[PDB]
Amino acid sequence: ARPCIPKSFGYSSVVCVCNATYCDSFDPPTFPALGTFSRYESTRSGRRMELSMGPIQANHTGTGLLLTLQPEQKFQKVKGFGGAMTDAAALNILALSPPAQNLLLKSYFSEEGIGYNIIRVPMASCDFSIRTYTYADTPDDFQLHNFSLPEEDTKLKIPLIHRALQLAQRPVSLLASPWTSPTWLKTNGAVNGKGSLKGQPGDIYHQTWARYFVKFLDAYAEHKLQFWAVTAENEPSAGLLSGYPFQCLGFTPEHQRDFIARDLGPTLANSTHHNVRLLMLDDQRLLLPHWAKVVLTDPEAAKYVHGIAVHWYLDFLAPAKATLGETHRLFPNTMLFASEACVGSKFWEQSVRLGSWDRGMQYSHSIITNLLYHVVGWTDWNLALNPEGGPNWVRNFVDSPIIVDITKDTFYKQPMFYHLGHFSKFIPEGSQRVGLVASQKNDLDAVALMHPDGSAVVVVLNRSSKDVPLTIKDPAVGFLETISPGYSIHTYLWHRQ
């Protein structure tokens, strides 16, 4: 319905400019007949999830790369896609006028947008907060009588999450993760730095920390919000690092194992929130398979663990096969889930680069890689940031797909936004990854999935400068003849029946 209004800021591509009365959006989805495909295209040259259609033919006119769907080769089912309602994101969104806020929320959660169905929610403060605080700062309160939700929750995060669910295309799943406990539960008595919980799994410290998880859930429940899942701690390895700058809580794999087995597992199970899933790790995949081996080979811990949550900071390179692949092999019945990704901390690089095509490609290349190694979901970090990558109480170092400029009541939708949407829009919960076979060595990245209703969705990413002529074969339908232009991403959809 409404096209991107482009704007360059000097980087390789454009942002799309939205404001109180205008934002780019889609029409409702339309279901073309068997023999017709839909293609959505984004390009570094400026196209933004532009729709076209064409035929799937019985004859084959391409002589280059062929990608053959193999619908009978079945892999993981998809949980979903989303991002984090941090203090910083809530603050930025609420800094726009109400009509602009709604266009931002629709861009992410609406069928007029890209269909998010996951929100990660920090349990109290992180670096993307404008202060350090927790839910129970009154010291030596072991029964957590003074546990309460501050304004950040009751005024910023919660009302914005209700509004997102109201707008939402699909059921949305909430995920919670803590950065720090009350410092009076910590070896180091500090919000950050090298410090873990005091004492031993089973003691009053470990039992109070677990009670906190339930207290959190009770409070959101009062606010009529329920969680799909919680993580056992955000990046537990960080809090073992001397002088780590942000809110953390250190756990060795062994400590997490025993904390889950002795404390968090039982406490959750004995509560009215026993249906909430528990995910372990919530940290870099570089810590796999080791971290999985340690926790999941103890039946006492394993009974409480539904999945393994992973992060990747994308400016790096950690091999997927040895980590995700091998972890799947060793524990094929415990789901992998990407719970946090972000980019831009290269000290020589701007935290926000408005219009960076590279950062976009980094998003989609990662999602493809994830999906190719059994990951069932992918969650972005901050939903929105200001143009400096903030607010952040320690230091700005990362980008966000939506950058908010409050002095102009405008927000910019980055290439990252559209690289994400090529997946989130077109891969509903319960879609299953299926085979897609390359006829020859090639420069593309691609992934095929089958919707719950049986239809096909294929994403093709070209991170090269050169156009790649391409045929996609569906055995039940025929040959789809196309070209993957240099620096483009396409999502193809077609009925198979």
Ligand X SMILES: *[C@H]1O[C@H](CO)[C@@H](O)[C@H](O)[C@H]1NC(C)=O
Task: Report the nearest approach of ligand X to the CB of residue 18 (Å).
Answer: 8
Which entry of 340, 349, 429, 481 is annotated as an active-site residue?
A: 340
Phi (first) and psi of residue 378, to 5 degrees: -140, 120
Strand pairing partners for 449? 433, 457
Give the interface segment with ligand X, choosing from 15-23, 182-190, 241-249, 481-489 (CB under 6 A): 15-23
Q: Does 5 bind ligand X (CB under 6 A)?
A: yes
Number of residues near ligand X (by CB under 6 A):
4
Task: Report the nearest approach of ligand X to the CB of residue 295 (Å).
Answer: 51
Q: Please identify which residue in the block is written with the tokens 């200001």.
A: 386
Question: Which residue in 419, 280, 398, 385 sits closest to 343, CA to CA?
Answer: 398
Q: Tokens at residue 36, please?
A: 């017709």
Q: What is the DSSP string of 412-450?
A: EE-HHHHHHHHHHTT--TT-EEEEEEESS--S-EEEEEE
Between residues 3 and 189, which has the closer beta carbon with respect to ligand X? Answer: 3
State which amino acid sits at residue 366. S
- Which of 22, 133, 244, 313 binds ligand X (CB under 6 A)? It is 22
Between residues 9 and 22, which has the closer beta carbon with respect to ligand X? Answer: 22
Task: Report the nearest approach of ligand X to the CB of residue 200 (Å).
Answer: 59
- Which of 3, 7, 8, 21 binds ligand X (CB under 6 A)? It is 21
Question: Which residue in 86, 22, 18 sits closest to 411, CA to CA?
Answer: 18
Between residues 9 and 184, which has the closer beta carbon with respect to ligand X? Answer: 9
β-pairing verdict for 229-231 and 335-342: unpaired
d(CA 444, CA 463): 7
340 catalytically annotated: yes
- Which of 9, 12, 19, 464 binds ligand X (CB under 6 A)? It is 19
Give the interface segment with ligand X, choosing from 14-22, 196-204, 238-246, 365-373 (CB under 6 A): 14-22
Q: Tokens at residue 447, please?
A: 């992934």
β-pairing verdict for 65-77 and 335-342: unpaired
Task: Report the nearest approach of ligand X to the CB of residue 452 (Å).
Answer: 37
Between residues 19 and 187, which has the closer beta carbon with respect to ligand X? Answer: 19
Which entry of 152, 235, 429, 481 is annotated as an active-site residue?
A: 235
Question: Which residue in 336, 317, 209, 310 sits closest to 263, CA to CA?
Answer: 209
Which helix or strand (DSSP H or E) is residue 362 part of?
helix 357-372
Between residues 21 and 272, which has the closer beta carbon with respect to ligand X? Answer: 21
Between residues 14 and 457, which has the closer beta carbon with respect to ligand X? Answer: 14
Give the interface segment with ligand X, choosing from 18-26, 277-285, 288-296, 458-466 (CB under 6 A): 18-26
**Residues preceding discontinuities in the chain at C–N > 2.5 Å?**
none
Between residues 7 and 329, which has the closer beta carbon with respect to ligand X? Answer: 7
Q: Does 406 bind ligand X (CB under 6 A)?
A: no
Environment class of 28 (CB within 10 Å of its CB; exposed 0-12, middle 13-18, buried 19+): exposed
Q: Please identify which residue in the block is written with the tokens 């532009």.
A: 50
State which amino acid sits at residue 13. S
Task: Report the nearest approach of ligand X to the CB of residue 2 (Å).
Answer: 8
CB 311 within 8 A of CB 340: yes
Q: Does 313 bind ligand X (CB under 6 A)?
A: no
Q: Which positions are catalytic?
A: 235, 340
Chain residues binding ligand X by CB under 6 A are 5, 19, 21-22
